[model samples]
Target chain A: EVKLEESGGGLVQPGGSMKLSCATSGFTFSDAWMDWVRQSPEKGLEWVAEIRNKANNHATYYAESVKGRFTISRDDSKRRVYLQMNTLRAEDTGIYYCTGIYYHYPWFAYWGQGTLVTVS
Target chain B: DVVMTQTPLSLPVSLGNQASISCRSSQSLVHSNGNTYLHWYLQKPGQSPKLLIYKVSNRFSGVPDRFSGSGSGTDFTLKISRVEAEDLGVYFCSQSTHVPFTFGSGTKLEIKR
Candidate 1:
């Protein structure tokens, strides 16, 4: 079974930056694209960004809302994916989940339990 | 970015009844390679979203036959043949054919007491 465990969420002051991690297992990290999604009572669900390193073709994609403020990266050797957001605000508070999409598949198939982040 | 508009933001149903949710995208979900990437997901209370249907009509592994998806281009629908206690939650429609993959606002499925 594939599993994604996310960490590095808690509290952040306004204008601060945050970094979240998804430690993965049961699959080759470099073979799939990792995505960051967040949900909040106020904003529902939103896709933030995605990153992949298939055959050394590193690529990253971000939501237009977060194009300049969010960044996604990964450490294939360590089997971990990362999401970094700069200049946080109250609207950014939510529970974030990391999802995995295999190269051959177009939909998200693996998901993390999620980490809660609060900005004040 | 594509906008996914879902209807009947809230649904109330009794056990064994059928439930249907509609999703309309701002544009066609067909990618340049000739594949539609519209998918459905269910987010149970206090849990992450789980895939129900993919590529318009295919159910994911272990998803019950009760759940079905249909439609093409900019329109889609997800149907539940029989609502079960465990099915109470929010249903979301998403598209991966474009960048900034987007999700519908979501439809809340509440069990009728």
Candidate 2:
């Protein structure tokens, strides 16, 4: 089984940006399907982003709600996946989660503890 | 985006009894690719959610057989037979078939005895 830990949680001012990191272990960083999720008091767990590969031509998908505001990236050297959100709004504040799956795998086998983001 | 709905919000089960939770999707989860991306997860207190069943009834490795899943295009159910005290947690049903990949509100299960 894999373990995921999320860091870099804190408050961000309006119109600013924040970067969250999820470090994964017990798995290869470049080969796993890193998927991002989030939760808020009003909204349930929401799918935010997905990074498909680690190469230069990697493909990424962002949820419609967070499309223009977030980017999913990775640091293969550190076995970490990153979620960068910009132009933060008060509503963007929430707890973020990350889960990993192997390509074509039916389910996410590993999950990150969680990271909270505050916006003001 | 598909709407994933689950019920009841919470369930109280006596030790060694049976319990079941239902999840309904706003649209069919069956896809032309011949895969139903319905999955189930359990979140134990103070722990991250764990995947229990994937693609309907396929149990994930290490998940007990007593935790079974079944359903169709839009309706699904997770049944726990012979529930134990360790089974106390929140169960969720989520779909990966379509975009947005919605999830249930979760059913809280607590031991009654």
Candidate 3:
């Protein structure tokens, strides 16, 4: 058992939507930077979004490739990050990972098992 | 976004032998705040990827010395010494300098016959 475990995956029809989840335990999730990274079949790893903490508020920086179709959100009370992709496409099939940074540093930690998503 | 060009697309090392992969970024890797965002990762199947090196050469905790990183500005390298079976996987070069957080295509590491 680790500090994090990701859930949510399966087949979704084109134009359908799906929400992936990354649940965190054993740590103060609020202080960490939440991020979503995906690795498509036979493709390289790509960052989809990051749930960042700014002052007392939060926001996300989405990759241009997913700017419109993807939405990444955070819930401090439940210690989780929600990655929802709307209007899916076959090219969206891939293994998604949830990870976090220690703080403002570039060092990454608190990783979770990947969520495998398939868009049919 | 800065492109980290990694090569050898694939590699095979004999047991106990050494292996190396290279990464060349499309721009200067020095971050705005005097930080070098060049990092390295090892993606062993069935598990989330693991961080190997950060800031060009600082090895992450628990990472073996056999895993060495070097180079500056644009060209960087990750050398694996005393190759072990567990090292079997795909390696990637990632930059945290800019948005979209880009990564190299990856180098597949296999065992030599």
For this target, which candidate reaches the highest lDDT against the unseen true structure?
1
Per-residue error for A94 in candidate 1, Å, reads 1.1
**What's model 1's TM-score?**
0.92
List model 3 lDDT by residue over B1-113, tens digit each: 78778989899889899998999999988878987888988888787778778888988888888899998888999999999997889888998877757889999999988
TM-score of chain B of each: 0.95, 0.96, 0.94
Q: Which of 1 and 2 is ahead in lDDT?
A: 1
Model 1 over residues B1-113: C-alpha lDDT tens digits? Answer: 78999998999998889999999999999899998999988888778888888999998899899999999899999999889987888899999898777889899998886
Docking class of predicted structure 3: medium
- DockQ each candidate and list the results: 0.72, 0.65, 0.69
Real contacts recovered, all predictions = 0.72, 0.64, 0.76
TM-scores, each model vs. reference: 0.92, 0.89, 0.93
Clashing pairs in 3: none
What does the lDDT read for residue B99 in candidate 3?
70
Error of 3 at A100 (Å): 2.5
